[PDB]
Design a protein around this ligand. Structure first.
Ligand SMILES: N[C@@H](CSC(c1ccccc1)(c1ccccc1)c1ccc(Cl)cc1)C(=O)O
Ligand SMILES: N[C@@H](CSC(c1ccccc1)(c1ccccc1)c1ccc(Cl)cc1)C(=O)O
Ligand SMILES: N[C@@H](CSC(c1ccccc1)(c1ccccc1)c1ccc(Cl)cc1)C(=O)O
Ligand SMILES: Nc1ncnc2c1ncn2[C@@H]1O[C@H](COP(=O)(O)OP(=O)(O)O)[C@@H](O)[C@H]1O
Ligand SMILES: Nc1ncnc2c1ncn2[C@@H]1O[C@H](COP(=O)(O)OP(=O)(O)O)[C@@H](O)[C@H]1O
Ligand SMILES: Nc1ncnc2c1ncn2[C@@H]1O[C@H](COP(=O)(O)OP(=O)(O)O)[C@@H](O)[C@H]1O
Ligand SMILES: [Cl-]
Ligand SMILES: [Mg+2]
Ligand SMILES: [Mg+2]
Ligand SMILES: [Mg+2]
Lengths: 329, 328, 328
């Protein structure tokens, strides 16, 4: 049982300028995406899909947060391991969703910013919810990228983003791995968040000038780990450990990690006995927070442009295979 | 009746001038011959020479091409046959210049008196000149589609988004023909309607290029003009296709590739000819071994840099002389 | 002999410092070792260490490279051996800088005293300096060709179009040699004639880059100096080839491709070395297993980003030390 949602972005300047026509109709209430498929030859042809949620070009970042993350974030707190992926063609709002943007000329606080995506929102809520819940807790973040199956550490104290991590099988866990060299930062409070996210962005900006099409060919794994203490009446300590992975996948257009994931998601769906985690860096990193027993969701991002027809259809067929709902009448 | 093939060599462009280019191409209009100098610094004497139905050297103007090639063909179209002219050769050699032409800067001339105007505008002008006089009742429909990455686009459509796609089907009426579903055919009521249409055409293409990669040199351009003629009651229907191919130096090359294969099958006389394997060859099926009369303008550059492509375009053009058609 | 192999590491460039690059390369001139840190953030102790005939760190200047590598080689050329020095490495690591160098801006220095002059300019100076002294009668001729996409171009040709191609034939009076048909070999009567000749070759090369895709990173440069010494009463001939290979990371790459297969076969004493399968390996047949005496300058960047390509340059160069030539 994996959750699959779809988010159509609005038109960019390039599209308005080319007088783009839309071919995507999103029905929030019916949980349906509708695609106009016959160009000039057949005006009536439609292909329709159903998801667990459908957000239009209108959907505000917070609506996405509230609908997708909270119920998931709850499970993380109950001490489980969860992943949310953003998926789709380059240019369709994966990075906008997973992490959002800064409104120009410091105009709201980072946490007030209406353009902020899932990552910065999630961090804000983790403290909010746990500072006032009462118990003792710590919060650790990591951020790494995968490019041509090599691993980079965006939060590392090393000034050269190009120093590469390594990955080993975790002996204390048969579903886990150890990322040798991975920096994890203790986030002591709400007020430590931004500077961390800023240093991470600065490194990524550098990564992109060093390697070709770094932005679209790379996977971002942002990871939060929450540690939750409680003592018993006679002094013994019961730890809960929660783990959320926020994953900004490489662009889907037509990459070992990307195809491999697809097959892992299939193997989980139609329940074929061997699921091929080992095959890619990304599915090995992720394995531990996949399999069921832990909530997984997928935000599929599409474009509304006519130009992006095939790409959009392809995204949708991919999402549909991840979870197959029949259409209502 | 054999495809006629002509060769047109353009003059050097500024970039060639600036790089001090040597010509390696000699045209002899009167013997109808092109001779290419193939041996660089190594062998100053070796040449490859070819004979064609006509050869146009560097200093050939737009009007010369019109009078030698297009006039005789438009008269055949006016007598109710079908004809096709296509431009073949390397990027930058003047396929577009020959097929469409250019507007001289500063509006120095009227569109129909512009000496840079190419075959499509001259032809439209002459369909009108020639038929208003002769006195018959007639109409003229035009269409314009581009093939890019095996997808069909409609330059003249009223739709504002160039990317809306056409579809292609077998004609149940004509065993070699196709139906292009959704293709706007514009009725041209007269000469003074011509320009605006072409200009909307141009602007739509300009948008296509900003949307799609290497659109200009990777796409094929199919311009069609249907003439209905009335003259008890006797009607003739003439059709003329003006095609402007992808750059010959070249999914993405499928129509060019299939064109080549279709041509070889026709010249070697292989029993089965793969027209169906590309959108371009399905559209041209009647021009290539069917009953349309066909002419090819093979364009070439005179520069030494372009030697291998020049040879390639000449060999390819020369063998296409061997294809037999058979009008009405 | 064995092919001599030396390594040159360049300093950081502007982009590397902007990016805050760390070094992963430590050169030890005394031990003749190059040591690369391969563990990144994961593993601080892993290294890969290679011993060469000579190693030049980031602070090495053109003159140091010249005294240690070329002076000895030119001494041998003067006693009439054949010699080859070629530069191998990823794009941007300093092949051209080593073989040719650059001119300092604003005419601050005579070409003879330019601290940035590479091997080619300094050899030509030194050749006259040495022989003007001995008073033995001598002549010097030069030539400079480039290979791109398996085509040959002559940068010293009097022909104004750099794209007129050369061709290549077996040498009838040498089993391992070729003759380049059309190659301008220029007699250099005195040091005062050297600079204008380089200037012209450079300008012809500037034009070539504007005419062909990635011409500078995909082409091989072959500069050849021939020295005739009238001495007994005999002619002694010394040949020096200075070769600047295309980027290692790379018909477009046929010559690099065959260069690798030729090297592999020389290391595994394989029956038939495919010298004929590219223009380059045919030009270099003597220098690769033949009677010519060969040095390879492997060029590398110090930056962590370039780890994979640096190692591969080092593996590739290192193995070429096993190969042996038998000089004159
Ligand atoms: N899409 C932007 C990030 S915006 C953003 C950021 C941008 C510039 C300076 C500091 C932070 C950001 C946007 C809104 C609220 C908080 C953070 C951010 C959010 C999450 C993460 Cl992983 C890293 C950075 C980019 O990658 O260029
Ligand atoms: N060949 C140019 C357009 S020139 C041209 C044109 C250009 C700009 C505005 C209006 C017309 C043109 C040039 C000379 C005489 C008539 C038309 C034209 C000719 C044939 C056709 Cl299919 C479309 C346009 C292009 O590829 O964009
Ligand atoms: N990297 C430069 C060459 S530098 C150089 C040169 C540069 C510009 C004008 C004239 C010469 C050069 C540098 C220092 C001393 C003499 C020559 C040079 C050296 C060898 C040869 Cl084949 C040709 C030219 C280029 O090829 O563009
Ligand atoms: N829902 C949305 N609303 C407004 N702008 C969006 C939306 N989704 C994407 N964008 C814009 O489109 C551009 C590309 O989006 P991006 O997040 O880079 O997509 P991807 O990560 O898939 O490349 C960004 O500059 C962003 O502002
Ligand atoms: N016969 C010719 N006379 C003058 N200019 C020409 C001729 N043929 C081509 N040109 C010029 O060369 C350029 C390339 O021609 P073009 O028609 O665009 O080549 P292609 O369409 O085959 O890529 C244009 O700028 C055009 O003006
Ligand atoms: N040893 C060196 N010392 C100083 N600068 C260098 C050195 N080697 C290379 N460079 C610089 O690196 C740049 C690229 O060098 P180049 O010789 O063009 O590389 P390649 O020919 O291997 O592609 C040049 O602009 C040059 O100034
Ligand atoms: Cl021009
Ligand atoms: Mg992105
Ligand atoms: Mg064109
Ligand atoms: Mg170079």
């Amino acid at each position: 049982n994996i959750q699959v949602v779809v988010r159509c972005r609005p038109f960019n300047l390039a599209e308005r300028k080319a007088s783009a026509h839309s071919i995507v109709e999103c029905d929030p209430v019916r949980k349906e995406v509708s695609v106009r498929t016959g160009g000039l030859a057949d005006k009536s042809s439609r292909k329709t899909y159903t998801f667990d949620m459908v957000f239009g070009a209108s959907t505000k970042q917070i609506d996405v947060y509230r609908s997708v993350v909270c119920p998931i974030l709850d499970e993380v707190i109950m001490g489980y391991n969860c992943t949310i992926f953003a998926y789709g063609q380059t240019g369709t709002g994966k990075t906008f969703t997973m992490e959002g943007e800064r409104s120009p000329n410091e105009e709201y606080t980072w946490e007030e910013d209406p353009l902020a995506g899932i990552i910065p929102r999630t961090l804000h809520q983790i403290f909010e919810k746990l500072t006032d819940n009462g118990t003792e807790f710590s919060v650790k973040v990591s951020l790494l990228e995968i490019y041509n199956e090599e691993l980079f550490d965006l939060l590392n104290p090393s000034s050269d983003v190009s120093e590469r991590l390594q990955m080993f099988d975790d002996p204390r866990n048969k579903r886990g791995v150890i990322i040798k060299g991975l920096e994890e930062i203790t986030v002591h409070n709400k007020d430590e968040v931004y500077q961390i996210l800023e240093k991470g962005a600065a490194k990524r900006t550098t990564a992109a000038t060093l390697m070709n099409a770094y932005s679209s060919r790379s996977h971002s794994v942002f990871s939060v780990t929450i540690h939750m203490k409680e003592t018993t009446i006679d002094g013994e300590e019961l730890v809960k450990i929660g783990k959320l992975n926020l994953v900004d996948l490489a662009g889907s257009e037509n990459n070992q990690s990307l195809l491999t994931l697809g097959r892992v998601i299939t193997a989980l769906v139609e329940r074929t006995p061997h699921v091929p985690y080992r095959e890619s860096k990304l599915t090995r990193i992720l394995q531990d927070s996949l399999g069921g027993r832990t909530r997984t969701s997928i935000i599929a991002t599409i474009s509304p442009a006519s130009l992006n027809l095939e790409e959009t259809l392809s995204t949708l067929e991919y999402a549909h295979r991840a979870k197959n709902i029949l259409n209502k009448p």
